[PDB]
Design a binder for this molecule. Structure first.
Ligand SMILES: [Mg+2]
Ligand SMILES: [Mg+2]
Ligand SMILES: [Mg+2]
Ligand SMILES: [Mg+2]
Ligand SMILES: [Mg+2]
Ligand SMILES: [Mg+2]
Ligand SMILES: [Mg+2]
Ligand SMILES: [Mg+2]
Ligand SMILES: [Mg+2]
Ligand SMILES: [Mg+2]
Ligand SMILES: [Mg+2]
Ligand SMILES: [Mg+2]
Ligand SMILES: [Mg+2]
Ligand SMILES: [Mg+2]
Ligand SMILES: [Mg+2]
Ligand SMILES: [Mg+2]
Ligand SMILES: [Mg+2]
Ligand SMILES: [Mg+2]
Ligand SMILES: [Mg+2]
Ligand SMILES: [Mg+2]
Ligand SMILES: [Mg+2]
Ligand SMILES: [Mg+2]
Ligand SMILES: [Mg+2]
Ligand SMILES: [Mg+2]
Ligand SMILES: [Mg+2]
Ligand SMILES: [Mg+2]
Ligand SMILES: [Mg+2]
Ligand SMILES: [Mg+2]
Ligand SMILES: [Mg+2]
Ligand SMILES: [Mg+2]
Ligand SMILES: [Mg+2]
Ligand SMILES: [Mg+2]
Ligand SMILES: [Mg+2]
Ligand SMILES: [Mg+2]
Ligand SMILES: [Mg+2]
Ligand SMILES: [Mg+2]
Ligand SMILES: [Mg+2]
Ligand SMILES: [Mg+2]
Ligand SMILES: [Mg+2]
Ligand SMILES: [Mg+2]
Ligand SMILES: [Mg+2]
Ligand SMILES: [Mg+2]
Ligand SMILES: [Mg+2]
Ligand SMILES: [Mg+2]
Ligand SMILES: [Mg+2]
Ligand SMILES: [Mg+2]
Ligand SMILES: [Mg+2]
Ligand SMILES: [Mg+2]
Ligand SMILES: [Mg+2]
Ligand SMILES: [Mg+2]
Ligand SMILES: [Mg+2]
Ligand SMILES: [Mg+2]
Ligand SMILES: [Mg+2]
Ligand SMILES: [Mg+2]
Ligand SMILES: [Mg+2]
Ligand SMILES: [Mg+2]
Ligand SMILES: [Mg+2]
Ligand SMILES: [Mg+2]
Ligand SMILES: [Mg+2]
Ligand SMILES: [Mg+2]
Ligand SMILES: [Mg+2]
Ligand SMILES: [Mg+2]
Ligand SMILES: [Mg+2]
Ligand SMILES: [Mg+2]
Ligand SMILES: [Mg+2]
Ligand SMILES: [Mg+2]
Ligand SMILES: [Mg+2]
Ligand SMILES: [Mg+2]
Ligand SMILES: [Mg+2]
Ligand SMILES: [Mg+2]
Ligand SMILES: [Mg+2]
Ligand SMILES: [Mg+2]
Ligand SMILES: [Mg+2]
Ligand SMILES: [Mg+2]
Ligand SMILES: [Mg+2]
Ligand SMILES: [Mg+2]
Ligand SMILES: [Mg+2]
Ligand SMILES: [Mg+2]
Ligand SMILES: [Mg+2]
Ligand SMILES: [Mg+2]
Ligand SMILES: [Mg+2]
Ligand SMILES: [Mg+2]
Ligand SMILES: [Mg+2]
Ligand SMILES: [Mg+2]
Ligand SMILES: [Mg+2]
Ligand SMILES: [Mg+2]
Ligand SMILES: [Mg+2]
Ligand SMILES: [Mg+2]
Ligand SMILES: [Mg+2]
Ligand SMILES: [Mg+2]
Ligand SMILES: [Mg+2]
Ligand SMILES: [Mg+2]
Ligand SMILES: [Mg+2]
Ligand SMILES: [Mg+2]
Ligand SMILES: [Mg+2]
Ligand SMILES: [Mg+2]
Ligand SMILES: [Mg+2]
Ligand SMILES: [Mg+2]
Ligand SMILES: [Mg+2]
Ligand SMILES: [Mg+2]
Ligand SMILES: [Mg+2]
Ligand SMILES: [Mg+2]
Ligand SMILES: [Mg+2]
Ligand SMILES: [Mg+2]
Ligand SMILES: [Mg+2]
Ligand SMILES: [Mg+2]
Ligand SMILES: [Mg+2]
Ligand SMILES: [Mg+2]
Ligand SMILES: [Mg+2]
Ligand SMILES: [Mg+2]
Ligand SMILES: [Mg+2]
Ligand SMILES: [Mg+2]
Ligand SMILES: [Mg+2]
Ligand SMILES: [Mg+2]
Ligand SMILES: [Mg+2]
Ligand SMILES: [Mg+2]
Ligand SMILES: [Mg+2]
Ligand SMILES: [Mg+2]
Ligand SMILES: [Mg+2]
Ligand SMILES: [Mg+2]
Ligand SMILES: [Mg+2]
Ligand SMILES: [Mg+2]
Ligand SMILES: [Mg+2]
Ligand SMILES: [Mg+2]
Ligand SMILES: [Mg+2]
Ligand SMILES: [Mg+2]
Ligand SMILES: [Mg+2]
Ligand SMILES: [Mg+2]
Ligand SMILES: [Mg+2]
Ligand SMILES: [Mg+2]
Ligand SMILES: [Mg+2]
Ligand SMILES: [Mg+2]
Ligand SMILES: [Mg+2]
Ligand SMILES: [Mg+2]
Ligand SMILES: [Mg+2]
Ligand SMILES: [Mg+2]
Ligand SMILES: [Mg+2]
Ligand SMILES: [Mg+2]
Ligand SMILES: [Mg+2]
Ligand SMILES: [Mg+2]
Ligand SMILES: [Mg+2]
Ligand SMILES: [Mg+2]
Ligand SMILES: [Mg+2]
Ligand SMILES: [Mg+2]
Ligand SMILES: [Mg+2]
Ligand SMILES: [Mg+2]
Ligand SMILES: [Mg+2]
Ligand SMILES: [Mg+2]
Ligand SMILES: [Mg+2]
Ligand SMILES: [Mg+2]
Ligand SMILES: [Mg+2]
Length: 93
RNA sequence: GCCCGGAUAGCUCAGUCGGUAGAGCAGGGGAUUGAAAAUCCCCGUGUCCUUGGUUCGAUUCCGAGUCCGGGCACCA
RNA sequence: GUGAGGUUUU
RNA sequence: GGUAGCGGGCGUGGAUCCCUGGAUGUCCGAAUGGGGGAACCCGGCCGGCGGGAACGCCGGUCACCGCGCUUUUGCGCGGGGGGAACCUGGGGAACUGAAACAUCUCAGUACCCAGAGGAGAGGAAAGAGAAAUCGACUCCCUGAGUAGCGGCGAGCGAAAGGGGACCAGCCUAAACCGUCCGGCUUGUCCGGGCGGGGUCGUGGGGCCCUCGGACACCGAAUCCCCAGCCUAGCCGAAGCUGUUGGGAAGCAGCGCCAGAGAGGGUGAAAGCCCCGUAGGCGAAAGGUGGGGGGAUAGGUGAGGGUACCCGAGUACCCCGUGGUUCGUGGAGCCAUGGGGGAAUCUGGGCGGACCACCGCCUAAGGCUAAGUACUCCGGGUGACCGAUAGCGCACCAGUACCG
RNA sequence: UAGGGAAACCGAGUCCGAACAGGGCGCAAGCGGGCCGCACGCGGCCCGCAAAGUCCGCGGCCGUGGACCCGAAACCGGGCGAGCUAGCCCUGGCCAGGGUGAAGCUGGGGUGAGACCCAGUGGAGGCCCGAACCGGUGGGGGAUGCAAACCCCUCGGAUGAGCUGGGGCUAGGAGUGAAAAGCUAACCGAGCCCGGAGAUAGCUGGUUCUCCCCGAAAUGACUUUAGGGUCAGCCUCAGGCG
RNA sequence: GGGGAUGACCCCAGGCGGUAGGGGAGCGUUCCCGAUGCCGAUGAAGGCCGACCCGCGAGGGCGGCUGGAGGUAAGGGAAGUGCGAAUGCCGGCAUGAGUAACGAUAAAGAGGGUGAGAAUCCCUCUCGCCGUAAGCCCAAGGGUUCCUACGCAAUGGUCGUCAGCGUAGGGUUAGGCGGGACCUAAGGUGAAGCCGAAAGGCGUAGCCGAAGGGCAGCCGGUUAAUAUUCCGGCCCUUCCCG
RNA sequence: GCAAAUCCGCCUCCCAACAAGCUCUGCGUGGUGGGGAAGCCCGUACGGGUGACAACCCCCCGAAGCCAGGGAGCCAAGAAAAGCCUCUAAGCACAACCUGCGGGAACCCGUACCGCAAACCGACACAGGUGGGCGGGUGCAAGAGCACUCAGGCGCGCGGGAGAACCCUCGCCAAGGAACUCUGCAAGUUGGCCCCGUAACUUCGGGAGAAGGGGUGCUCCCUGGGGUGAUGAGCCCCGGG
RNA sequence: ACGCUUGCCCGGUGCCGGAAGGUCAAGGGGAGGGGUGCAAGCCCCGAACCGAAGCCCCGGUGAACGGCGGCCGUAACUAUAACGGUCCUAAGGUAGCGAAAUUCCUUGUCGGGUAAGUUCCGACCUGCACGAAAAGCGUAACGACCGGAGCGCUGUCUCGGCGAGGGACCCGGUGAAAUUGAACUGGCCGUGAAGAUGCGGCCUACCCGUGGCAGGACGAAAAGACCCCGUGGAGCUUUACUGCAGCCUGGUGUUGGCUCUUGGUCGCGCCUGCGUAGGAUAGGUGGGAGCCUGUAAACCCCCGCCUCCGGGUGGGGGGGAGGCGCCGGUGAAAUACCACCCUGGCGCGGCUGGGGGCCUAACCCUCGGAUGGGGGGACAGCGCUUGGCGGGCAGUUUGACUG
RNA sequence: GUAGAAGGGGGCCUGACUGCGAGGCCUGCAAGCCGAGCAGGGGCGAAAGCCGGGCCUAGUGAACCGGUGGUCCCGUGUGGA
């Protein structure tokens, strides 16, 4: 799925397996022996954030783990202790 | 094709961690046992892989591989 | 407290 | 109404018909009070009716999601679904071609999903590429089947520049400043929304000093008005006689008009029998108004000092990938799935491994008309057809019929 | 209109090369030609629209496009179907009649007590015979039939591993399967409908008016190739030699 | 090759079987320039003939009959341009041929009536068949096929006056019967929540979901067609009001 | 009882205890109402008057149906929720609930016909298939089987001649009895009930209805009973001589 | 189902276990080189070494896949095998059956059944080519299964006949079907693509029908259902190829705090060499007549240090001119003065590489009413990357000449 | 085919060269083979002359992708790689 902050999507990518040592390191070269479609995913991980309303769980990538904890200090001057444990979620940017 | 361990007597094998070497068969007669089997005894078969070198030497150590194998590639 | 690779019938 | 037939009534006091604005518009259908096997059933609240408490009906409101206000209640603004073809993004084949065939081609095509449009996408250079050059973007013709890629086989295939259609450029965060709120050490600072301040490569901009003068100019893509166009239409020249025949428009005589001798109908073959073509008028009302006049928002300058800021897990490196002609080749650039990981103009990216010089441009935020594709629909044309043609249907057709 | 060379680069020359040896590429060779300018080297001229090429038309052929037409077995994408059939879940219904007589119970015999035996009672079985019912073993008819799976007789189970009504779930490289590769809407070694797709076919068939002139071949050299191909041989047309 | 009046008209010599093919010359059809024209009721295209004329031909002229309103030179062009074959297609009509069959071997016969027409329609008297149905009542399913009156255009495997066939008019009456305003199982949808590129897929509470549970009606008559509904007797249920 | 209870569950019980009381069904009787034939006249059809003041009594067989949530046995262990009964939370106790007495209201859809076929599904008025219930009587021991026949329908929607070969179905046959054929394939015999008898072998059940046989009709007399009815008179059943 | 058993061998393969050892990926590490720049710097390689899974190797596993022999001589001729010698050997089939659903020779041989038996039954074993859980031999009951025999009875037959109904036949009514080049369609003998109604010769035959047979029209149906070809298409298999699902595994993110001993380029330091032939704690060698020495020697008493148990080398606190080697002695080599690195027990400079023990907040599971308890615990799962297994799946290929 | 050496023996050398190659055999094409002669510089022989492998016919493999030396030709703005 999509990240909650950045938005990195699971992209498709070919898995081009081949056989043969290369040109400058060998004799002939690299011949492609088979191609197949492939489904690359991101590091979608869960993290708990202790806000005084509710301990919210997120879904964020490993390259954006410090974006969440950096985003707590940005999300500290906003309205704390909201009237429901769900409205704290979508009000991050 | 780099690397890995070796080629010993018709047969296969006792080996060195550098100063050693072969035992068994289709074989002839043989103390034996009161003239019976062969327990046991002489006995027919070493370029110890081809070759170069520390070395008193090479029947044994080390270097390239011609001899055969497993993994590893690479083959337009 | 100790002894047999062990035998065959003319 | 097609559309006959019986039986009735309307119209100059303007009937029928056409166009525009309205009202009603049962039920289903995004369906949306709820259920539901679509065109059915059952309700809640507020008013009314039937003698009306119990029963029924009518008129409003009651689905979900994202926003602003409302501290919760609730009120306003949008979205859901469909659309012949087109466009963008995310997935995505196989037969065929290589006279097999797995890389490749077919092809990022058919097809599936999402949203928007009368187009979409793209767009104001971290561009292009050799000339110190061009200067947003889109489309056509060239360049050119060229350079290139490719079991270097099949085959795929640019870009630069030029001639053209069109031409519009902008907005915002950052440094600095004012209010309010949040954490709280209520210190002298942090975090967020608003108001001024900035949109740059000739580097721009914040603060301070000097030159000052704008109170003059530009100007929308926003708004207002209007020319014009569309949804109904109107005016609009000119001929008779006799004969064959059932029928004259033919034929014979004398004529007429032409800004109209296109077409169709008229018992047959007509410029002068009719409807209209030439040409000119026509809007009360509703749409368009890219065309043209006005208004506003918004823009306007030079030197010195300071080096505070110029788009963060981002540039860059490695592995795995897609696109450009680039299939891993010397493999650049554009985005990145993962790992490491800064700087803010003495900072960076690019000019095809790479190093130095020399040139171009500021990425990591967003918007943008015009030129381009297509025809459900409107009309005109056709060396287009004429009921086995043409769309599947010229006819009461996506019907009868099959499943 | 200038071409060589892989390019650099050079140019009526270039390249191979030390080279003017030698060779491969092009080059100039003269068509209409009063050209007598009066030097028979004639320089080049009236001058055929040409050596010399381009643009358009009309034909033959070819490549990419479906490319003379018809016809597959198949592949992929999106969906429709478990009202037939296969399995299963929930809820109901069906099984006439007759017999054999298990476990237990009661009574009697037995001994010290049982175990054990007999009689009655008892009515369970994937029991037996046999109806509706679900099936089709064997025979006959039916064979453009009554029927795109029947009819007459005989049959196996018929209290169950049973039969069946109603509401559902499972699906195409998948479902289900007491397992045959059966069934999945009358045809299943991978359904049906649409689209790619006018797929491909060196494989069959067909290919429409007339007249005239010439006229073949079934051979050779090669191909994961022998029924098809490329070149040559054979034929025809046009332009030149004679 | 020649006379070369260049004659595109006649002499001389040679040749004229032919598939796949190569080449040359013509005919016919749709439309277009010619066409603001010409032909055409004294008769156009098309249809049926010709023993007529021209042409080696595809064919073109002319004459007669039918037809009732279009056709188009000469010279050219563009083709959706010439059919007998493709187990081609579409529509018609043949052969098979007055042939097989006429649909369970349960079975018909006779007298009257209607009617133009009767083995087939209506009535009566005999005979046969089913009678755990070939009888009756419901749920499926079908959707006016039910009844009456008038008829045989078409249908009934023959006829038919009849018809489940056509035209018209009627006919289905519910507090108590079966469903909803009651509930639930398998299963489906689905607040919260979870997962997945999107379409979407799981999923608590709750909702839907039945031939399952609960709930108050029995007997007889009436029409050509309605009956636990209409009516006669008789008994109950739910809710509201005093 | 994811408790709030006087309700339910558990433990202490003076008692009752195979019972009785109280509630829930079915049947009979029951105020009363309806039906009332076969046969006969009028009969076009349809059917109508009828024959009555109609009778409407008794006996037996007897269900898979009702009481029902009965009883016994067995393992494979045999749904949910709603109505209704009861106790309470917030609330209300001038309310609200229950039983009577009188008066009102009861809504939307189905309703015809065929429904084991001519109207459903099979291109057809198709010898196929289609769920549930009633599905009579007599005899065969019984029975939804067989044969016939009540009520109800039907003669199957092409017939009439002759009575060739040949096809299908059926019946019969001197003598042989499987000799035909790949094979007793097909056809035929045995067949139901009661009574004697029943082998090899075995997992002791079975084989087994083994194989083999005898009887079955009708009339009269005597007699054992059982059920209902009353103890038997009457009526059904099992028999024996 | 059940009675008796599952005997032989682990060589190939599958599987399990393996802290010894070989190979190997990403990666870590990096001597030594290359390009460029005036250099500072930047960019490429890079051999040593470390580095899992997997493969190789060892053992086990046969109610795992899988198989289970030949040859020469010997007993009163024959026969043997029960005995003696070989192995492509891992191993040579044991019990129990056997011309059998197995047997080619074969109808093997004998006996029963019949008069006649290629079938059947019971044995013989000469098992091409039974066989022990792809189970071996029997077995009460049972089977719409197959094979054989007998019995009473039957047309099934020798050998047919007769009768009945529904068709067939005639008449009245309705009235198709596939096939079809046109047909005015004779036989024989020859020819013709090699099987003649049509061609040639001879013979026969008036035209047209009705009922029947099916010998012909190479009759009809289906574009052979057998065989071959197509570089046709599918289903299935495998140690045929390549990928994928899935599984194992190193690195890395999620993912942390500590501790123990081990590892690598690692020589600053410790003091390690005795098969040894003589005097031996004798390393190969380099100087080898000087220095241990009065800044505290010698028979051996200090003594940490290691040890093959002999013994030597450092702190030397009390000694007091004596230790004795270059040669002789050993030999493949001569020290005692200055150390060149191997052989090693060992302190540490660079990174901790791996293996354990504890806590745990991340993460996961779980508990009635869950911002809180319990357990696992930085492991699992998940992403990227690397290597291996992998017909479970998919795309595929498997040639041609050929009397 | 060869003794009027190509056969056997001895001396000296590597022409078992580099750039070409007129004219041909054969062939569909691709290939295969003979090659007098020119230049440079050699070997043998005093010279004339011969030597561009083997007495001859078989002893092999088109193309593409790459490896090792030289050439310094191109090398993507410039100089280099
Ligand atoms: Mg990171
Ligand atoms: Mg003795
Ligand atoms: Mg009108
Ligand atoms: Mg009128
Ligand atoms: Mg009127
Ligand atoms: Mg009027
Ligand atoms: Mg008006
Ligand atoms: Mg309107
Ligand atoms: Mg309304
Ligand atoms: Mg609704
Ligand atoms: Mg809905
Ligand atoms: Mg109100
Ligand atoms: Mg009111
Ligand atoms: Mg009122
Ligand atoms: Mg809206
Ligand atoms: Mg498109
Ligand atoms: Mg895309
Ligand atoms: Mg493909
Ligand atoms: Mg291909
Ligand atoms: Mg492409
Ligand atoms: Mg939309
Ligand atoms: Mg849309
Ligand atoms: Mg536009
Ligand atoms: Mg646009
Ligand atoms: Mg846009
Ligand atoms: Mg845009
Ligand atoms: Mg910009
Ligand atoms: Mg351009
Ligand atoms: Mg321009
Ligand atoms: Mg501003
Ligand atoms: Mg007018
Ligand atoms: Mg006018
Ligand atoms: Mg007139
Ligand atoms: Mg006119
Ligand atoms: Mg006139
Ligand atoms: Mg507007
Ligand atoms: Mg405009
Ligand atoms: Mg700064
Ligand atoms: Mg690339
Ligand atoms: Mg990039
Ligand atoms: Mg990234
Ligand atoms: Mg960069
Ligand atoms: Mg660069
Ligand atoms: Mg249109
Ligand atoms: Mg049409
Ligand atoms: Mg017509
Ligand atoms: Mg339909
Ligand atoms: Mg030349
Ligand atoms: Mg020239
Ligand atoms: Mg089913
Ligand atoms: Mg159903
Ligand atoms: Mg049974
Ligand atoms: Mg029944
Ligand atoms: Mg069956
Ligand atoms: Mg059958
Ligand atoms: Mg059978
Ligand atoms: Mg039976
Ligand atoms: Mg039975
Ligand atoms: Mg069934
Ligand atoms: Mg599919
Ligand atoms: Mg599968
Ligand atoms: Mg399955
Ligand atoms: Mg089927
Ligand atoms: Mg199929
Ligand atoms: Mg096709
Ligand atoms: Mg295609
Ligand atoms: Mg071809
Ligand atoms: Mg000729
Ligand atoms: Mg040719
Ligand atoms: Mg010529
Ligand atoms: Mg003449
Ligand atoms: Mg002549
Ligand atoms: Mg000719
Ligand atoms: Mg020809
Ligand atoms: Mg036409
Ligand atoms: Mg005229
Ligand atoms: Mg006329
Ligand atoms: Mg015409
Ligand atoms: Mg006429
Ligand atoms: Mg055509
Ligand atoms: Mg035709
Ligand atoms: Mg035909
Ligand atoms: Mg006849
Ligand atoms: Mg006949
Ligand atoms: Mg006939
Ligand atoms: Mg007949
Ligand atoms: Mg009959
Ligand atoms: Mg009669
Ligand atoms: Mg009569
Ligand atoms: Mg009469
Ligand atoms: Mg009759
Ligand atoms: Mg119905
Ligand atoms: Mg119907
Ligand atoms: Mg009707
Ligand atoms: Mg009538
Ligand atoms: Mg009629
Ligand atoms: Mg009729
Ligand atoms: Mg009449
Ligand atoms: Mg009717
Ligand atoms: Mg409901
Ligand atoms: Mg209601
Ligand atoms: Mg419900
Ligand atoms: Mg409920
Ligand atoms: Mg559900
Ligand atoms: Mg769902
Ligand atoms: Mg119900
Ligand atoms: Mg019910
Ligand atoms: Mg409950
Ligand atoms: Mg009814
Ligand atoms: Mg009725
Ligand atoms: Mg029934
Ligand atoms: Mg029917
Ligand atoms: Mg019928
Ligand atoms: Mg029927
Ligand atoms: Mg049935
Ligand atoms: Mg009797
Ligand atoms: Mg009886
Ligand atoms: Mg019966
Ligand atoms: Mg009767
Ligand atoms: Mg009848
Ligand atoms: Mg009849
Ligand atoms: Mg009939
Ligand atoms: Mg007869
Ligand atoms: Mg007889
Ligand atoms: Mg007899
Ligand atoms: Mg016989
Ligand atoms: Mg015989
Ligand atoms: Mg039989
Ligand atoms: Mg009784
Ligand atoms: Mg410099
Ligand atoms: Mg340097
Ligand atoms: Mg540096
Ligand atoms: Mg059975
Ligand atoms: Mg017979
Ligand atoms: Mg019949
Ligand atoms: Mg007839
Ligand atoms: Mg013949
Ligand atoms: Mg003839
Ligand atoms: Mg003849
Ligand atoms: Mg026949
Ligand atoms: Mg722990
Ligand atoms: Mg925690
Ligand atoms: Mg813990
Ligand atoms: Mg981990
Ligand atoms: Mg496969
Ligand atoms: Mg393929
Ligand atoms: Mg000589
Ligand atoms: Mg050549
Ligand atoms: Mg030689
Ligand atoms: Mg560059
Ligand atoms: Mg450069």
């Amino acid at each position: 799925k999509v990240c909650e902050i950045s938005g990195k999507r699971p992209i498709v990518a070919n898995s081009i397996q081949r056989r043969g040592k290369a040109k400058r390191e060998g004799g002939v070269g690299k011949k492609t022996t088979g191609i197949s479609k492939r489904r690359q995913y991101p590091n979608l991980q869960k993290v708990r954030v202790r806000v005084a309303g509710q301990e919210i769980t997120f879904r964020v990538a490993a390259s954006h783990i410090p974006k969440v904890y950096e985003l707590v200090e940005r999300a500290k001057g906003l309205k704390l202790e909201g009237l429901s444990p769900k409205e704290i979620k979508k009000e991050l940017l």
